[model samples]
Target chain A: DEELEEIKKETGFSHSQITRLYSRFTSLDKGENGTLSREDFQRIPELAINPLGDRIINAFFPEGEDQVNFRGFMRTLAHFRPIEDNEKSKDVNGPEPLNSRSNKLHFAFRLYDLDKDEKISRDELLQVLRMMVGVNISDEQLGSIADRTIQEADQDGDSIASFTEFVKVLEKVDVEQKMSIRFLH
Target chain B: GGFQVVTFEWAHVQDPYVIALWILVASLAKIGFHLSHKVTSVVPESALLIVLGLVLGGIVWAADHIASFTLTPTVFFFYLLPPIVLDAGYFMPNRLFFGNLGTILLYAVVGTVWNAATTGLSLYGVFLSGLMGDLQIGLLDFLLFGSLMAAVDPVAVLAVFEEVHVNEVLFIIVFGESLLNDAVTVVLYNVFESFVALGGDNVTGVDCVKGIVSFFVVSLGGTLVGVVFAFLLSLVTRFTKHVRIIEPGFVFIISYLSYLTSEMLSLSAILAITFCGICCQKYVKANISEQSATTVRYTMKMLASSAETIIFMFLGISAVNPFIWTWNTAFVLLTLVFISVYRAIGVVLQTWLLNRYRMVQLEPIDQVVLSYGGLRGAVAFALVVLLDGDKVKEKNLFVSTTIIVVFFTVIFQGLTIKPLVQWLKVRLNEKLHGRAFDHILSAIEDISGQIGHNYLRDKWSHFDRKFLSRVLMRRSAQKSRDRILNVFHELNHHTLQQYLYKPRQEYKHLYSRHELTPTEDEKQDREIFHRTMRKRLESFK
Candidate 1:
């Protein structure tokens, strides 16, 4: 149905087609609060298979909100909805696709921002990492990791990380993931 | 109470009154400082001390309260100088100071010696010429006079510079030289005093070499001790950030310890306290909690500001005592002319050497201003006070001449510096184009604005339109929403840019360089907004 809605956006969706997704969104948002939380995410089995899954989902939900509002959910759905590959491919050359990746970085940054501040501090990074691994780390180890993370991108030695820092870290790891393929080519 | 404890208790009773008098002078000076901006453009709070001291001298002259009002050498060294020196070190930016450390040293060490020598030789010539009425000053006395005037005071000049917005490089070099030269002057004064005390007969070359060696040794030793003490405090703050209440107290303890240790070791306490302050402000501060760091800042400011007010007030009080204010017109004139010549020579030579070495570039105007800015104040006064108490022949004349020179420089030179600075600024502009300051200022404004706008678009739109649209808000609300977005965008840019780069260079031309910034008011608004928002966010978080 999400795929059909994408087809309809390029060649106009009918009123019936729009209402159908609306009802689906309402059921998933069972509390009628026009939003979805982690529980709502768990309930929606279709989301697990969705191509836009974690990146955009995290982006739309954000760290502080921790859930998507009705508008956010709609936007997320439209973005992920299946469209012609040729048409979607055109967006890759423009700023549009970078916006999506930037959203991913934004999501990750906010997740680590901890206090809804723009900058991600060493303590925040440590806390989030401890949460991620779901294990305790010694203060020394945590500080070490935080320090290394900051040193990587905090060029000015102020000892804090930023969105640019997040992106740089991502791009570095990404190159490693593609290293063998690059060599093969 | 125990026998000795009685003295302690008696002293304790007077502490509040001592503090009250300080606050009284500080408040009066504060008012004078603000009034100075209105009464005469760019006159510093420092000048008020001279004026106030002159008027207040009646207390000492008429009421015979000289004992209560006077500063003993012990009191001057311990109680007054530390905070002033500490504040200097605490607030002086490391990059600027150390970046030109070579030139600073050249001026402080070589330049001070050169300046003193020329002045002393000229005064020795003056003594032979019979300028003064049978005063009979010796070569050693002339040398001591030269040393007394070698250290230039920055208090009045810095205050004026703050208003004129003098070039940062010029300010730092001059300011750094002044601070470092204090150590040099003290050494020079002591060296000469000792030479004179040893019956001015031996005057051997070995003693001259020893004097120079001790100067370097004292400077290096003091700086080392300060750095070590600073490192110790940094570790303390690093480990105990949780116990913030003790942070400011420790800053005080450690700074005083650095000074005391250097003094006890017969090194320069001025240099020690100054370096310790610099290190504490630069490195150790980062190890402390933000609140504690802020408290330390305010504490330093309070101490330094009041010390300045009180020092000048004391000078003024002593000024009215015609006994202290020596009207040695010929001696004073000779001292002034010789100092002016040596100062010009010192700055000219240092500037050439620095530029020739590719270390730093100084314009001729900078040299002129630097030469002119060598106004002798507190340190000179302090040295002369020692001479007064030394009961040397012609001690009154020495004291009187130094006081008159200080008064003349602090008032006359202090008043004229604004015009001198303005002239130099214009002269530099004519000589060069697109200097770093103009480019930097324009670029920062553009970047701050751009960053603010970017942030506003992302955060403000949903905040207003979605929430406000739900209510019965109409056209005016729409207008209000747009206006708010515009305002926030500008504000957001300022905050993001400034926060991202503490030194502002880290912004790295994110907004692209601009020929002209929007407006000064907008720039100020951005700063104010950033400060307010940062505080609010920190508190909320």
Candidate 2:
């Protein structure tokens, strides 16, 4: 519960996102229709916010903005909590919250969700690698990660990242009791 | 006052206090102009800014006659204005310019090359004639004069065009040419100068070409280095968004200094400055707010406008006896013919060749207009001053002739070209704004045809309820109502266009459809029209 709470603070999922996630799991009111639905979730402005959505919200809320409601938070957990400690990240199959990177036990080797857009642009990847890896990384590393991510997540190859695919990479934390590995946020 | 101030005795025997006070007044006017410019224009109007400079310069000139003091204000307006105008182009952003860059570079490269080559050829002939004193100008010096003067006063040219509203591509051509041409021309001139100065013994054309190529490289290379320089500074000073102040200062100082330093290295100073300016524009992230752009525009406008006024005012300031003008008329006439003849040759041949590669074709009238419009102005005068003592009289005569030609072109041909612009405008007017609305307005014809043909024409009472329901929806109903009318109208539109489009599209790259159809073939020649127009309209940015 404490771990869940900490992840929630870091990610700070939007109220509407949580509301929709919970409506799927709990069937709480998601719209004026009094039933959970996609339209209700898409209506929120934060629907477009991605990857570091949690960090952005927590760090820089405009003055007088309200914290997300509790019921929304509960539903968000049911959809996004991670499945296991030792499985490869993509191998896991569970509805996941976007802030689950704290569980190093959840994925094999390591899982890092890098960038604010959640999905990186080609130039962004170069910029990040050059900055973090000190500018000497192989062209292969640059090419593979970009090509793979684009191929796998880009769906139709329209050169754009979809919201659903973006969310999956961001939210994975250990849920399986048997696994022993952990993840870094 | 002491004697021996070179060719003069007793400090030229003038009233010192009078000249001194006069200098003070002139200095103040100049200071006021500069100060006013900073407050008003972030990029300032180049012509106006230049005008202010010239005016203050005149004031100082007049003040010197007062014998109180001597003053020479040296802002190097040509060097300064081009880059600043380029900065204005940057404000428009690269995305907006890439499509038009071919045209811009066309003007830049071709214009500069023509200017230098012609000036060199003409001046060389004059110098060699021994009438203009010595035939000693190196191909290098000749090239320098060409390029230097070829640099159009975008400020003057652009200002006039802004009011008329020209195509964006033309503006970019003017602006880009002003900014980039100087450097390349300078390098070519210098190399040729050095080679010629060396008694023409060692340097081959290849050597000159290589030197010119390297000159371009150094310009671009310096900018690349400057980017690194700016990047390092950005890393250190990343904390503030007010980067424009420091960054532009870098541009201003580094641009001129780099050029000067490059000259010291026996490289091309012009090329270095050009490269540096382009680079600074590329790298410097000046939050050149709308406010700053406005400020610079106004400031430059004020200065240039003032300079223009004062220069004209001083044109006859000392006194002119056209019949007894100090220079020899016969020599002046010859030099006039020489300058005009050479400049015309340079333009006509260069323009013809360069134009062949362009997507468009130029008509004969366009060719003639371009030939006649090469008016030599202030830079010619400036170069004349740079000539050696023996060359001074001939240079002065050249200057006088140049002034006369520029005045004639600026006043007469300059005035004549406006009609061609007006003719081009007739074509532009037909194609501009509201024509796009026709596409949207076709809905009415579309909807009425479907309802009439399918339902009423056949007198069919029997129809699927589903079909009826589908047509009742807002979108379907609209399309159904106009379906027949739209088909008929579209057919008519297509049938006429089928005949019109073949030749029209064939030449559309060069001449607009309307321009092509009306008057003489060259009547719509943009080169004929846009050449003088290009210079007149350059400063608007």
Best model per TM-score: 1
User: Could you tell me the lDDT of residue B45 within candidate 1?
Assistant: 50
Taking the tens digit of each residue's C-alpha lDDT, what string does model 1 give over A32-136?
876777555533322222222222245456556677765555444333222345765665755353224454345446646757688888887666444322123
lDDT of 1: 0.60
**Candidate 1: clashing pairs of residues:** B53-B316, B53-B317, B54-B316, B326-B400, B451-B493, B452-B489, B452-B492, B452-B493
**TM-scores, all models, native as reference:** 0.58, 0.43
**Model 1 chain A weakest 10-residue run by lDDT:** A176-185
Q: Write the per-residue lDDT of candidate 2 for residues B386-411, one digit (tens) a residue.
A: 33334222334444554554454444
> How much is the lDDT of residue B347 in candidate 2?
49
Docking class of 2: incorrect
Worst 10 residues of 1 chain B by lDDT: B508-517
lDDT of 1 by residue, B400-504 (tens): 777777877777887787777776676111111111122222222221222122234434345536652333233454477668867544322222222211122
Interface RMSD of each: 24.1, 29.7
* Stretches > 4 Å off in candidate 1: A1-185, B1-19, B39-41, B388-391, B424-541
Q: What fraction of the native alpha-carbon contacts across the interface, defined at 8 angstroms, is recovered by model 2?
A: 0.00
Worst 10 residues of 2 chain B by lDDT: B510-519
